[PDB]
């Protein structure tokens, strides 16, 4: 159905997995991957499993068929791909946190690309066994900015830590980005 | 279904949203986005929800999938996108007003491209939350023109401000642009 | 359906309009644009309106959607496009007559491309609002040719008016250039 | 359906008409073009007429849409195109005969390509209604050959004028061409 | 259906004929061309003949459409193309046999291009009415490779013969080439 | 249906066979290949056989059409292709082992890509009839790493050979890669 999914070439596994899961959810098949295996399986379950396996095999590049050649269901294929490409290791978290704690904003880059990079790093941390909530994301985003945003950083941190959301902080930062680009 | 929609890469959100809304209306699915949530859900409503969510996910770039990563409906995805990209802000509208006031037609550019740029700026300013009347758009268009159009700028302002539509002014400006190009 | 209709980008509006109308007629949707609005609208009429609007939006560039941005029917979109791009402006007619009269053939040119250029100029001129019959088209085409064609030009202008058509004249000119190219 | 059909740009009209007729016959729609118009029209006839007209418009270049701008059926479009193009002017027949009378075999061209070109010329001339006997075709083919085939020319002329066929002459010419290429 | 069939332009007629016959067998139409004229004014027979003619015409280039312009059955069209491009002539067969016997192999081209040339020569002999079996093909192939392949040529020729194919020999020769390239 | 299948040209036969089998299963046609032939054949079985043969032929290159020239079914084509290109021979697997020995890790390549290449080679070797135990896979993986992994290799070797799996070794090597890339 959806043909905007680039075949898995070993790069950007999160995006491919998300698009495959969305496409499966379109066809009322995502219950196979997530839902528990019923004690008795009927024709509908078999058809759903066949459709999920066919879709996953179709959206895998030629070199990656070996993840599906064996007699393994779609959920097993996704589990194997997740284990190979999204592994929960403390070393990965420790390596990624140092990059996240040293991610300054370059002058030539706008806050939209910087926000995209920061969100990519946060999602990569969350892929491993990390527990980062909204407040930690806000704190990292605030500490990953140059000195021109000191006023908004001081003002935002004074706000109560119960209604703060990442979108609100991002909008407040973009407003001062617009203000700052005028004063430089 | 319709592959003329450019994936949303953070630029020209109004066009992308309009195209997505039109595509959803074609499939008889737009009732998810705008129609009220029924008290009792059925198979048709769930199918429409899934189809709308899958279409929106299909027509988003790889960077913007975090708007749909959460288990939320297509209506909520569009609401979040509206709040993050079509929010009403005063600083942004002030910057757009400055850009409109500092907009000058270049010699190389033709009046059609200048009109397109002016309409884009007006649409962005209106989305930013600045109410603009037709006469304000007409005055901006008149003052954003070079000295070659001074005669027609003076002539147009003398007309009564009761049926002066932007289309008539644009047509007259094109007609005199033909004469201006004839004399160069 | 058909992808042979190039998206509208401000050039060759008549061809795009005709192809869009033909595509709408193929899907039995042209009654929306041409047929009178019924007093009571049913599911079929609104479905046809949605299909026409989606088709026109799909075959419009991202810069030309400002007309359709307002929630208005496709018939009004076509009417606005016609008013903007097919307007009875005398200055455009005069400029296109001046360009058409001074349209001498170049040495490095193919007469099929010359016919294409002449026909697009004529189509633009008719869009400008100046009616040109057949005889004027043949006269302009004949006067646009060099002196090497004088024999066939005189033979054609000596022929009867009833048998004189633009396509027949173009065929005669092709037959003559075959000899001209052979005789070199 | 068939994408092998080249859009009609004013050249080789017979090929385009044959391809379009075959495509229409594929969809069981050619009955509209060829069959008599029924006194009472139904939904099927209207759908077939719409499909035929839409296909003809789709497989027409931008320079020939004027043949379908008027509100006419596909039958009338094909009739007008036949009237304009399915007629051989005196100059066309004279040019065909001149090409036949001045046809020669080049060094780089093989005998298969030359035979194909000669057969194409004969087919085009017969399309104009010029009856040609087999001996005339044989004489034309023999005089269009170089001087390297004089031996087989002398051999062929000595055969009785009762069993001379074009196929036998072509086979003998190819057999001699094999030796001629060997004798170099 | 099958679009891998390239349009016939007087090149590699055997491949095109095989693909066309396979496509006709897909639609159960081969009875029209291979049957002993079981004509009994059947509607199914007429439909099959029309479908065969349409399929043959679709996969023919514009140059070669003169082979099917007349009202001849698909069997007659295939027979005419066979008589034109598969001519049983002993002189051509002898010349091609000389070409095979004096083939050898170059110093720069890989085994794949040499195999393609050998396949072209063998197919042209089979077109020329020469009866060649698998063993004859292997014997012709194995006398053209350089002395670097003698170690595998002797081993292949020493085998028990019986059930060995040209494809297996080609695979072994490609493996030997892979082993050779590491040294030379 | 799916045109993503590269036509077979003697390279990567397993991928081509898997894609062809998947496509046949999609069309409800694969039952002719795996399922037993019924004693009495009906029209449905004949249609499925025709579809399978035509689909296999369509995705065979012009060089490999000789595998289906004779009157054979899809099963015969697939079994002949298996016998020629999927046979379990010493020569088939010795080359694969010699390629595994020379799979040195490059500096620009991450261990994810190198692990994928090693897995592809191991799967190809398994398809070559050479059964490989887990420890052999681990040793083959370990001998392809540079001197930067000496410590982890020694630690792995000192481990007991009871529950040492390839996944555990790969995870340890990836953690060591993180540590190494940190130390540069």
Numbering used by the authors:
A (entry chain B), B (entry chain D), C (entry chain C), D (entry chain F), E (entry chain A), F (entry chain E): 3 to 186
Structure paper excerpt:
Here, we show that the Ty1 retrotransposon Copia forms virus-like capsids in vivo and transfers between cells. Copia is enriched at the Drosophila neuromuscular junction (NMJ) and transported across synapses, and disrupting its expression promotes both synapse development and structural synaptic plasticity. Because Copia behaves in a viral-like manner, we used cryogenic-electron microscopy (cryo-EM) to determine the high-resolution structure of the Copia capsid and found that it is distinct from the related dArc1 capsid, with a larger internal capacity and the presence of pores similar to those used by retroviruses to carry out their reverse transcriptase activity. The capsid layer is composed of the Copiagag protein’s CA region, which contains 2 alpha-helical domains.
To enhance the resolution of the capsid region, we used local reconstruction methods to determine the structures of individual subregions of capsid known as capsomers, which are sub-assemblies that are found at the vertices or faces of the icosahedron. Because the Copia capsid adopts T = 9 geometry, there are 2 different hexameric capsomers along the faces (a hexamer with local 3-fold symmetry and a non-symmetric hexamer) and local refinement of each hexamer provided high-resolution maps (overall resolution of the non-symmetric and 3-fold symmetric hexamers are ~3.5-Å and 3.4-Å overall resolution, respectively). The high-quality maps of the locally refined capsomers allowed us to build an atomic model of the Copiagag protein with high confidence and good stereochemistry. The NTDs form central spokes at the center of each capsomer sub-assembly, while the CTD is arranged in the capsomer periphery. (D) CopiaGag non-symmetric hexamer is colored by electrostatic potential. The positively charged (blue) pore is at the center of the hexamer. In place of the spikes, the Copia capsid contains positively charged pores at the center of each hexameric or pentameric sub-assembly, similar to HIV. The positively charged pores of HIV function as gates for dNTP entry into the capsid for fueling reverse transcriptase activity. We hypothesize that the pores in the Copia capsid play a similar role.
